[PDB]
Amino acid sequence: MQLFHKAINRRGTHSIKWDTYKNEELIHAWIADMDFVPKPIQTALKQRIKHPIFGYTLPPENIGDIICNWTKQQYDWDIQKEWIVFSAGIVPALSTSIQAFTKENESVLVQPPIYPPFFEMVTTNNRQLCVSPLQKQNDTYVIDFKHLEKQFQQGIKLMLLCSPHNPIGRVWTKEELIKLGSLCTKYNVIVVADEIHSDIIYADHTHTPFASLSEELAERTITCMAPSKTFNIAGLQASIIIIPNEKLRHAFTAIQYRQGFHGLNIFAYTAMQSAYTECNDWLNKIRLYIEDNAKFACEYMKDHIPTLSVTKPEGSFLLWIDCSALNLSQDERTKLLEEKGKIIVEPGEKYGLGGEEHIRINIGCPRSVLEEILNRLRHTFS
Amino acid sequence: MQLFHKAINRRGTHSIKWDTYKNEELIHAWIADMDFEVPKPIQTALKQRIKHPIFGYTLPPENIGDIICNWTKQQYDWDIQKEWIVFSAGIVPALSTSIQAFTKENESVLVQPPIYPPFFEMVTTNNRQLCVSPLQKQNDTYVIDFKHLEKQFQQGIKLMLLCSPHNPIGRVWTKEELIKLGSLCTKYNVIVVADEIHSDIIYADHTHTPFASLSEELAERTITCMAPSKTFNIAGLQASIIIIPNEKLRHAFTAIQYRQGFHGLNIFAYTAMQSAYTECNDWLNKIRLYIEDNAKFACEYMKDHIPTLSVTKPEGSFLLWIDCSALNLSQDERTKLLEEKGKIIVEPGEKYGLGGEEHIRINIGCPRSVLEEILNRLRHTFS
């Protein structure tokens, strides 16, 4: 309980959240790393350094079962060791997938509002970017399956599924994924399942890995998972990509190979060793801190900033806030946020359709700091 | 001092060096990382940052840009601008990025064998036309057949991969050799990617010349790749420095990495490389003198003890290029004998292109103890 009350000085660690701006007054609620690493990981790093050579390394011989135990323990999902491919980050895994399974000018589908690199790795690779925006319903979000099918029909070859979905916190139901999977089989669509928030699911929700539902879906899906957001080690660049389809996996690794890829750095393996073995109770406690943090913020906004709409999150530590009642431009919202509130939130307009007049804030903070964020929002717009 | 005589037990450390095969007497002389511990200031730099127990996304160190310009000026008399510096998680991804940025499919990329195999792999796996200009074994070493090299340039070469110092033959190119190379690249508009990852281990009678350093013309048509990985045994930290003076080429390079989702080095590449170019000077000058002494030890040892094998004299790096053709044995009957009779796996020359056949390469970046034993095992194998 007394582990996560920790306000931590992250100024002067060259961290992208706190060291880009140097007005000391600012609070940065926009980037997606936590204000929290479990002790067994930092202990693991000190141990590895005790051997003073840092040359080329293979993945540790025990990493494959560690990973196969991790998926089965956490999602009741059984994987084969030979399905596992390493990636020094998930965004390169998307770009690799775009290159591996689509040709130039072919259609890549995404579901906005969505983490912008979904947009960027498509267009910067000359693939045609297609969208099927999500629909705001029941004060949360749903998939417009009719619109989605219409898009699949125009020749979509590849879809990027974000699950849990950044920035809206949707944790997809088993049934939603089965309706979607049925559409990918119908139109033979390969799915990249960005499931990097796989492990921060709130109490009343269950992460269902898309590939886990059926052998059909498994043979058409590239699953991207990682302890980076989960354990706050994003700067170490450790991701796990799971491709049961051997033929898809080979074409995936051939893209990596021609890009000079030779596996993760030494500390990415070490960290991921400890992350998936020696940190279970830290993760159980960190889930309840954030979920309880979420409920605090939504209660705060009803009592204190009633001008503001909030998507009820179901996983990860991001909070999606609709500001449309303020009837404010992005420019006049952002500038007011920095000048009057002394805070940098995440602007929603860069997330595509349905991001406009929204902001996002990071609730991966000690509660105290969340108090400070909520108070400033309140002061900002009223 | 007693820094480099300490043999290190690195089987059971998941490093590619001693963990491929699991028969313990075996020596695997084929890996090109050294058997020397990282300088203590690097281990201290790593321990220091680990005291801050968060490891999120981090920006490059605000002082890294002047550190690198200080490094290039100090080590090679090369003045560079901070904005030329581009980061890369290793040299091979920088070889590939350069191919994708500056040549289209089927356009011709030339390499000079015998050469490090990734030079070929990134050309062919990238669907570019592979051309060659093999080096010539001349006066006990290797030289460039400039007339052949030119004959290829006339046939439309768009990009050249220069490795300098040359892995595995150890050649540190003279300014005069490189000046002749540059003038040919200007004439036929060849872009040069300069593999200079070995720039910092040069022996006593030789000087490393950055190709881009010679002239402004050559700087604006050259991508120079550098790294502390080989110099200080931190390859697994995946830290490289790419210096692209031409603004238009630099944007085309950065544009390829960006579309491949690249977002810069890991936290410990930044930490480690800072110390490498600041707090490790005296560790390096000892290690260049150590390796040179090992290199001078291997070539007279085999001359006096294993006369069946010719040895190209190295001028830099910690690799040694050994001509075995006098046995006149195939690759398999060489590899087989080396493991059963000598209990040793060396790096096979045949995968190095023309000039690789019946050559082997051993790593001499090891304590003398092991180099004795390797040469000793070489002796028994071939005699």
Coordinates of C-alpha atoms in Angstrom, one line a residue, chain A residues 6 8-10 13-17 19-20 22 31-37 41-42 45-46 48-62 88 91-92 95-96 99 115 117 120-121 124-125 229 232-237 254 257-267 273, chain B residues 8-10 13-17 19-20 22 31 33-38 42-43 46-47 49-63 89 92-94 96-97 100 116 118 121-122 125-127 233-238 255 258-268 274:
Chain A
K6 CA 5.7 8.0 -3.9
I8 CA 9.3 10.9 -7.5
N9 CA 11.7 13.6 -8.9
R10 CA 11.9 12.6 -12.5
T13 CA 16.7 11.9 -15.9
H14 CA 16.4 13.0 -19.5
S15 CA 12.8 11.7 -19.4
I16 CA 10.6 12.8 -22.2
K17 CA 7.8 13.6 -19.8
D19 CA 12.8 17.2 -19.4
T20 CA 11.5 18.6 -22.8
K22 CA 12.0 23.7 -18.6
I31 CA 3.2 11.3 -22.2
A32 CA 2.4 7.6 -21.6
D33 CA 4.9 6.4 -19.0
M34 CA 4.0 6.0 -15.3
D35 CA 5.0 8.2 -12.3
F36 CA 6.0 5.0 -10.6
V37 CA 10.1 0.0 -11.5
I41 CA 13.7 -5.4 -11.8
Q42 CA 16.3 -2.8 -10.6
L45 CA 19.9 -4.9 -13.5
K46 CA 22.5 -4.5 -10.8
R48 CA 23.7 -8.3 -14.7
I49 CA 26.3 -5.5 -14.5
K50 CA 28.3 -7.5 -12.0
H51 CA 29.6 -9.4 -15.0
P52 CA 31.7 -6.6 -16.8
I53 CA 31.2 -7.6 -20.4
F54 CA 28.4 -6.3 -22.6
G55 CA 29.0 -7.8 -26.0
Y56 CA 26.5 -9.6 -28.3
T57 CA 24.0 -11.9 -26.6
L58 CA 21.4 -14.5 -27.4
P59 CA 18.1 -14.3 -25.7
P60 CA 18.4 -16.1 -22.3
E61 CA 17.7 -19.8 -22.7
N62 CA 14.8 -19.6 -20.3
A88 CA 12.9 -3.4 -29.8
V91 CA 5.9 0.8 -33.1
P92 CA 8.6 -0.9 -35.2
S95 CA 5.9 -0.8 -39.4
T96 CA 7.5 -4.2 -39.8
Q99 CA 6.0 -3.9 -44.8
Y115 CA -2.6 6.7 -30.8
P117 CA 1.8 6.3 -34.7
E120 CA 2.2 7.7 -39.1
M121 CA 3.8 4.3 -39.9
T124 CA 5.2 7.2 -44.1
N125 CA 5.3 3.7 -45.7
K229 CA 4.1 0.3 -20.3
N232 CA 7.6 1.4 -16.8
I233 CA 10.7 0.3 -18.6
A234 CA 9.8 1.7 -22.1
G235 CA 13.3 3.2 -22.4
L236 CA 14.7 -0.3 -22.3
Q237 CA 12.9 -1.4 -25.5
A254 CA 12.8 -11.2 -43.1
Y257 CA 16.6 -9.0 -41.0
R258 CA 17.0 -6.7 -44.0
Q259 CA 16.6 -3.8 -41.5
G260 CA 19.8 -5.0 -39.7
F261 CA 17.9 -6.3 -36.6
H262 CA 20.0 -8.5 -34.3
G263 CA 17.8 -8.8 -31.2
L264 CA 17.2 -6.7 -28.1
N265 CA 19.9 -5.1 -26.0
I266 CA 21.2 -7.0 -23.0
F267 CA 19.2 -5.1 -20.4
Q273 CA 13.3 -11.9 -17.3
Chain B
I8 CA 36.8 -14.3 -17.8
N9 CA 34.4 -17.2 -17.4
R10 CA 31.7 -16.2 -19.8
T13 CA 26.2 -15.5 -19.7
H14 CA 24.0 -15.9 -22.9
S15 CA 26.6 -14.0 -24.9
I16 CA 27.1 -15.4 -28.5
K17 CA 30.8 -16.0 -27.6
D19 CA 27.1 -20.3 -25.4
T20 CA 26.3 -21.6 -28.9
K22 CA 27.9 -26.6 -24.7
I31 CA 33.1 -13.9 -32.2
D33 CA 33.7 -9.0 -29.3
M34 CA 36.7 -8.8 -27.0
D35 CA 37.6 -10.8 -24.0
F36 CA 38.3 -7.7 -22.0
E37 CA 36.1 -6.3 -19.3
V38 CA 34.3 -3.0 -20.0
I42 CA 31.2 2.4 -17.8
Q43 CA 30.1 0.0 -15.1
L46 CA 25.5 2.2 -15.6
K47 CA 25.3 1.7 -11.8
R49 CA 21.8 5.8 -13.6
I50 CA 20.3 2.6 -12.2
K51 CA 20.0 4.3 -8.8
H52 CA 17.1 6.3 -10.4
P53 CA 14.6 3.5 -10.4
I54 CA 12.5 4.6 -13.4
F55 CA 13.4 3.7 -17.0
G56 CA 10.8 5.3 -19.3
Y57 CA 11.4 7.0 -22.6
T58 CA 14.5 9.2 -22.4
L59 CA 15.8 11.9 -24.7
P60 CA 19.5 11.9 -25.7
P61 CA 21.8 13.4 -23.0
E62 CA 22.0 17.3 -23.5
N63 CA 25.8 17.0 -23.4
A89 CA 21.0 1.1 -32.7
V92 CA 24.1 -3.0 -39.7
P93 CA 20.7 -1.2 -39.4
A94 CA 22.6 1.9 -40.6
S96 CA 20.4 -1.1 -44.5
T97 CA 18.9 2.3 -43.8
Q100 CA 16.9 2.1 -48.6
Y116 CA 32.2 -8.7 -43.4
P118 CA 26.4 -8.2 -43.5
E121 CA 23.3 -9.6 -46.7
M122 CA 21.9 -6.1 -46.6
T125 CA 18.1 -9.1 -48.8
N126 CA 17.3 -5.5 -49.9
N127 CA 16.9 -6.5 -53.6
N233 CA 32.9 -4.1 -25.5
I234 CA 29.4 -2.6 -25.2
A235 CA 27.9 -4.0 -28.5
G236 CA 24.9 -5.4 -26.5
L237 CA 24.0 -1.9 -25.6
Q238 CA 23.3 -1.2 -29.3
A255 CA 13.0 9.5 -42.9
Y258 CA 11.1 7.1 -38.7
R259 CA 9.0 5.0 -41.1
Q260 CA 10.5 1.9 -39.5
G261 CA 9.3 3.1 -36.1
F262 CA 12.8 4.1 -34.8
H263 CA 12.7 6.5 -31.8
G264 CA 16.3 6.5 -30.7
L265 CA 18.7 4.6 -28.4
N266 CA 17.9 2.8 -25.2
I267 CA 18.6 4.5 -21.9
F268 CA 21.8 2.6 -21.4
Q274 CA 28.8 9.2 -22.7

